[PDB]
């Protein structure tokens, strides 16, 4: 009494991973054209998203594609004769390098930071030093045209896929999300690189949202997504005079020649009241996950400068703040915050950022970078929009010690690509009907199976049918053609709603028509009839083969 009817263009999707393409790389369109999916609830998992791995690869590839046509400082991996800067933090280094003409030499003097030098002999009169890691790999000088101001990147879908945003204002990142929306592109995501503190991010809509893969171990990074930003202003007060020498045929090396005025240390200012209010609210939100525990914030217990300090790019200069006056607090279950009196204060927390020039890029090891100096001084403002915390494991007397963390740059991108999931549309499906043979994309995803069988020409047209994109264009074409070939083999070519001669077997589903078309959505139906598609498809092609042979026999009768 019920027969298999093949539908094409149903609002059904499966989880999948594709090579989404940036679009600052291709001009973006007026709006993302967001279609809110009513009555749709999807399972997100921020800690298993692929959009993060793709963004990581894109960033470690754009960065390494801007330093390729730039001067490599091979001629400067020479013995330096360095004295104290009394005309330590900085040294006045003299060296003999190679000049533009490949037969002469050149004597130069530059001021380098002590963190950029490694002694060749007992450190004290001049002492011998070389540039850090220059004898282990090549140091590439950044071209003056390299843009150190993060540019928002929009990730847009290839044909055949959709980005499912999550609009629950209090979502942490993992688990079921309702009020799911479909978008074509993401918002503008800045590739901001910062350790311990997330800078220039998006704020939480409602409150501080503690998120972690598992708040029970001491390995997973805890991301604190703030609702109100704390403003940080960082400066390098020294008035630097930049000099340059040529080290080859068109290869210009830039360095600090002298400093005008006195020598002052770089620093960052965070208002005490705003910081300690932020840490109070984060300590009360972390008390909701670790009940009856004492919550303490302390400085990092170890590691390299890139993770024990707050590392950030300020107008190209790479600062490294101590951040040990910030993370010094105790919050107990009684609700009193130990370092009190910081709610009526006018003080400032001065963090002594150090400056480094030979920056060990990412952790590639075999590739460093030289950040050229900028004449004059530098001041940068930024918004602190989140924290990266690591919890201390082991036995304890009911006290948690959340110490800053970072270094892994995926956890800096898992705090803006948290709401986005990539899915692949499955426009081809089957359902029982009484039929015998003889708006926007996914807009009806949450509608019943009888109201989504009218919006088929809208999810069908939006299938839109170097290497990273071209392979996904070819893949989308292959998937489209495989679906068309399936329809053709079944005798359904050229139709979106196709009635067949295959009877419905009650073992596939025993629901009545008023329990399917009127009460269920296409996603629930796909989740029901999924183990049986390898039987239905075979029956459909066998029935079409029988119909084709019967048709040629009838057409040869006369």
């Amino acid at each position, epitope marked *: 009494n019920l027969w298999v009817t093949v539908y094409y263009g149903v609002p059904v999707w499966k989880e999948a991973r594709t090579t989404l393409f940036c679009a600052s790389c291709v001009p973006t369109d007026p709006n993302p054209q967001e279609m809110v999916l009513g009555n749709v609830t999807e399972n997100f998992n921020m800690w298993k998203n692929d959009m993060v791995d793709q963004m990581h690869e894109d960033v470690i590839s754009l960065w390494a594609q801007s330093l390729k046509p730039c001067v490599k400082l091979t001629p400067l991996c020479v013995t330096l004769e360095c004295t104290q800067v009394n005309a330590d933090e900085m040294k006045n280094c003299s060296f003999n390098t190679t000049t533009e003409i490949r037969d002469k030499k050149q004597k130069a003097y530059a001021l380098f930071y002590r963190l950029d030098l490694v002694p060749l002999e007992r450190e004290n009169s001049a002492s011998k030093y070389i540039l850090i890691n220059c004898n282990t790999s090549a140091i590439t000088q950044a071209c003056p045209k390299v843009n150190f101001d993060p540019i928002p990147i929009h990730y847009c879908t290839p044909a055949g896929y959709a980005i499912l945003k999550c609009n629950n204002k209090t979502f942490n990142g993992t688990g079921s999300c309702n009020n799911v929306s479909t978008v074509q592109c993401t918002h503008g995501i800045k590739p901001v690189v910062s350790t311990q503190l997330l800078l220039n991010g998006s704020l939480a809509e409602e409150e501080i949202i503690i998120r972690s893969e598992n708040l029970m*171990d001491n390995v997973k990074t805890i991301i604190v997504h703030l609702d109100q930003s704390v403003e940080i202003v960082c400066t390098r007060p020294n008035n630097n005079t930049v000099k340059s020498i040529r080290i080859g045929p068109g290869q210009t090396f830039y360095y600090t020649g002298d400093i005008i005025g006195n020598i002052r240390e770089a620093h960052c200012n965070i208002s005490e009241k705003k910081w300690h209010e932020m840490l109070r609210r984060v300590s009360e939100k972390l008390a909701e996950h670790f009940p009856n525990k004492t919550i303490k914030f302390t400085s990092s217990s170890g590691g390299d400068l*890139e993770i024990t300090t707050h590392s950030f790019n300020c107008r190209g200069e790479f600062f490294y703040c101590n951040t040990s006056g910030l993370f010094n607090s105790t919050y107990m279950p009684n609700g009193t915050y130990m370092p009190n009196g910081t709610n009526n204060s006018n003080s400032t927390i001065i963090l002594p950022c150090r400056i480094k020039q030979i920056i060990n890029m990412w952790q590639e090891v075999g590739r460093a970078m030289y950040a050229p100096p900028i004449a004059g001084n530098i001041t940068c403002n930024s918004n602190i929009t989140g924290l990266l915390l690591v919890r201390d*494991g*082991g036995k*304890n007397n009911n006290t948690e010690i959340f110490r800053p963390g970072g270094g*892994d740059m995926r956890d800096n991108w898992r705090s803006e690509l948290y709401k986005y999931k990539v899915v692949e549309i499955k426009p081809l499906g089957v359902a029982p009907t009484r039929c015998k043979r003889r708006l926007g994309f996914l807009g009806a995803a949450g509608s019943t199976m009888g109201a989504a069988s009218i919006t088929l020409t809208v999810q069908a047209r939006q299938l839109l049918s170097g290497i990273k994109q071209l392979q996904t264009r070819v893949l989308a074409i292959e998937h489209y053609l495989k679906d068309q070939q399936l329809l053709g083999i079944w005798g359904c070519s050229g139709k979106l709603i196709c009635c067949t001669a295959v009877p419905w077997n009650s073992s596939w589903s025993n629901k009545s028509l008023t329990d399917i078309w009127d009460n269920m959505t296409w996603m629930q139906w796909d989740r029901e009839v999924s183990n049986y598609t390898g039987i239905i498809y075979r029956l459909l092609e066998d029935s079409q083969n029988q119909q084709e042979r019967n048709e040629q026999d009838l057409l040869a009768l006369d």
Partner: antibody, heavy 121, light 100 residues
Framework: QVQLVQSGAEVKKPGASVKVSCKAS????????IHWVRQAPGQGLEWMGW????????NYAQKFQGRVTMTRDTSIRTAHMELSRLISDDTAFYYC??????????????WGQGTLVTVSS | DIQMTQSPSSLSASVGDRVTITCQAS??????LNWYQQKPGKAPKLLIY???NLETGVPSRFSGSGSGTDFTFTISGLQPEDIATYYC?????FGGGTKV
């Protein structure tokens, strides 16, 4: 073949510091966490701490904080642990261990040889 | 603090008897328990990576299952080569060990 080769047994007096090393061979050093486990002679296994050799991150247990320093030398693929202010209760077999996968690092499939540290007068 | 409670502390068995060892976590909400066979003089060996999944290089005689705060490890017939101290572990927390 994945191998972890640790230094041999050592004898220290109370108050001294001991440095233990765990040469790592067979895999990419800068992609896996190394866990240092202290086995008391007959009182079980204490976790004590993990080191992340990519950026050198550490997470010392809340008991052994202030006394257990961990470092790493990637040029020779060797991890180092330092335990200061030794007491007679610190006598144990110190084991170097790694997880089978970087994604799940608690499945300590790969272990080195134990380093015996004796603390006595 | 996630205290591991492991029992029995001492298990007396001959060759071929079925051995049952229990481990009671204080907090669970995740099937992440590991079982380590430690022979005297050797570093422990992992047998049950994850709560139930078995480790390569270990014969099928070893098994276990459980969830939440209650896990069970069994041996389908003790062999002469199976004399060891067995420990349960959840994240950084180790149990007291059962001598088999």
């Amino acid at each position: 073949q994945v191998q972890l080769v640790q230094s041999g047994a050592e004898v220290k007096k109370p108050g001294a510091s001991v440095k233990v090393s765990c040469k790592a061979s067979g895999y990419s050093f800068t992609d896996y966490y190394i866990h240092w486990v202290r086995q008391a002679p007959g009182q079980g296994l204490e976790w004590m701490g993990w080191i992340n050799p990519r950026f050198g991150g550490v997470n010392y247990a809340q008991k052994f904080q202030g006394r257990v320093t961990m470092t790493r030398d990637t040029s020779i693929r060797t991890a180092h642990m330092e335990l200061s202010r030794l007491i007679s209760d610190d006598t144990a077999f110190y084991y170097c261990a790694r997880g089978r996968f970087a994604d799940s690092v608690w499945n300590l499939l790969f272990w080195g040889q134990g380093t015996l540290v004796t603390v006595s007068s | 603090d996630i205290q591991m409670t492991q029992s029995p502390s001492s298990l007396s068995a001959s060759v071929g008897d079925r051995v049952t060892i229990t481990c009671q976590a204080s907090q669970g909400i995740s099937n992440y328990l590991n079982w380590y066979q430690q022979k005297p003089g050797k570093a422990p060996k992992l047998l049950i990576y994850d709560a139930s999944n078995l480790e390569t290089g270990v014969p099928s005689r070893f098994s276990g299952s459980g969830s939440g705060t209650d896990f069970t490890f069994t041996i389908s017939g003790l062999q002469p080569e199976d004399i060891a101290t067995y420990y349960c572990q959840k994240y950084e927390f180790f149990g007291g060990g059962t001598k088999v």
